[PDB]
Design a protein around this ligand. Structure first.
Ligand code: HEM
Ligand code: HEM
Ligand code: HEM
Lengths: 153, 153
C-alpha cells in the first residue's frame, strides 16, 4: 500500500505506548546493538535451517551491520516521527529477503529471539521500574511484529 | 493458501523448539487461561481504540470464552500435531475480526500484551529454569506472531 498508509500503521501502533517507552527501548537497544547483532548471528548459526543461508566471515560482517541498521531504524521511528523512513526500510528488507528466498518462518523465529533478548535487557536495567520494563517490552514486541508484517509484504 | 501449506507453516515454526517448550507453554497458559482472558479484556477496556468495540457484560462473557478457546487452540497444535485444526481456527478468527472491522494494529497490540504476560508467568514458574523460561518465551512469541499472520490473511 501507500507509504502514507504504512506510516500511519506504524504511528497507530506506536501511539499505544508513551514516549518514555519509545525512548527506553531506543536507549537500551542502541546501547546494546552490537551485542544484539552478535546474538542474532549466533542464533542463526545454531539453527540448521538458518545456517543454510550463512557462509563466510565477510557475510558475517555484512549481516552484523545490517542488523544494527535495522535495530536503529525500528527504534528511531516513533521518537523522531520518521515513520515513513522506517516503513520504506522495512519494505526494502522484505524485498531483499524475498529475492534470496528467506522463508518467513525463519524471520519470525529471529524476531521472537530478539523480543526475548531485548525484554531481558529491559528487565535488567536498573533505571526502569518493573512497570516500565513491561510496558517497553510490550512496545518492543508490537513494533517488532509490525516490522515483520511490513517486511513480509 | 491451502490448509496443507498453512499447517506446514505452523509445523515449521513449532519445530524450532523442543517438546519441553511446547508442553511448558501449554501447561502455564492453560492453568492461567481465565486470568489471561481477564487480563486481555482489561487491556482492551483501558485502550479507547479497543474499548470502541466493547459493550455490555454479555459480550464481556463471550470475549472471555473465545480468548480461552484461542489460547487452547494455539498451544494445543504442536504438542498434539493438530496443525490443521489450529490453522483453520486462526483463519476463522481472522474472518470474524475482518467482518467487524477490527484494525490489525489492535490485534497486534493485544498479542504483544499476551506475549509479555505469558512470559512473566514463565519467568515466575519455579519448575522452569531460566533457560527453559527464555526458550518457552521465544516459542510463545513465535506461535503468537504466526497466529496473528494467519488471522490477518
Ligand atoms: C528479525 C529478522 C530479520 C531482520 C530484522 C533482518 C534484517 C535484514 C536487513 C536490514 C538486511 C539488509 C537489507 C538491505 O540490503 O537493505 C538483511 C539482509 C539479509 N538477511 Fe536478514 N533479517 C532478518 C532475518 C534473517 C534471517 C532469518 C536470515 C537467514 C536465515 C537472514 C539473512 C539475510 C541475508 C542472507 C541478507 C543479505 C546479506 C547480504 O547482503 O549478503 N535475515 N536482513
Ligand atoms: C509471504 C506472504 C505474506 C506474509 C508472510 C504476510 C504476513 C502478514 C503478517 C505477519 C501480518 C500481520 C502480523 C503483524 O502485524 O505482526 C499481515 C497482515 C495483513 N496482510 Fe499479509 N502477508 C503475506 C501476504 C499477503 C498478501 C498477498 C496479502 C493481500 C493481497 C496480504 C494482506 C494482508 C493485509 C490486508 C493485512 C492487514 C493490513 C495491515 O495491517 O497492514 N498479505 N500479513
Ligand atoms: C491476540 C488478539 C486477539 C485474539 C487472539 C482474538 C481472538 C478472538 C476469537 C477466538 C474470537 C471468536 C471467533 C469466532 O467466533 O469463531 C474473537 C472474536 C471477537 N474479537 Fe477478538 N481477538 C483478538 C483481538 C481482538 C481485539 C483487539 C478486539 C477489539 C478491539 C477484538 C474483538 C473481538 C470481537 C468484538 C469479537 C466478536 C465477539 C462476539 O461474538 O460478539 N478481538 N476474537
Amino acid at each position: 500500500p501507500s507509504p502514507e498508509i504504512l506510516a500511519l500503521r506504524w504511528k497507530d501502533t506506536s501511539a499505544h505506548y508513551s514516549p518514555h517507552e519509545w525512548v527506553a527501548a531506543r536507549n537500551v537497544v542502541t546501547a546494546n546493538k552490537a551485542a544484539l547483532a552478535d546474538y542474532f548471528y549466533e542464533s542463526m548459526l545454531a539453527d540448521p535451517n538458518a545456517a543454510f543461508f550463512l557462509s563466510d566471515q565477510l557475510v558475517k560482517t555484512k549481516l552484523h551491520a545490517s542488523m544494527q541498521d535495522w535495530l536503529e531504524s525500528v527504534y528511531a521511528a516513533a521518537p523522531t516521527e520518521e515513520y515513513e523512513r522506517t516503513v520504506a526500510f522495512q519494505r526494502k528488507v522484505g524485498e531483499v529477503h524475498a529475492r534470496i528466498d528467506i522463508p518467513v518462518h525463519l524471520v519470525t523465529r529471529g524476531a521472537s529471539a530478539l523480543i526475548r533478548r531485548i525484554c531481558e535487557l529491559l528487565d535488567r536495567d536498573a533505571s526502569l521500574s518493573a512497570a516500565q520494563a513491561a510496558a517497553t517490552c510490550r512496545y518492543v514486541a508490537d513494533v517488532t511484529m509490525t516490522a515483520v508484517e511490513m517486511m513480509s509484504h
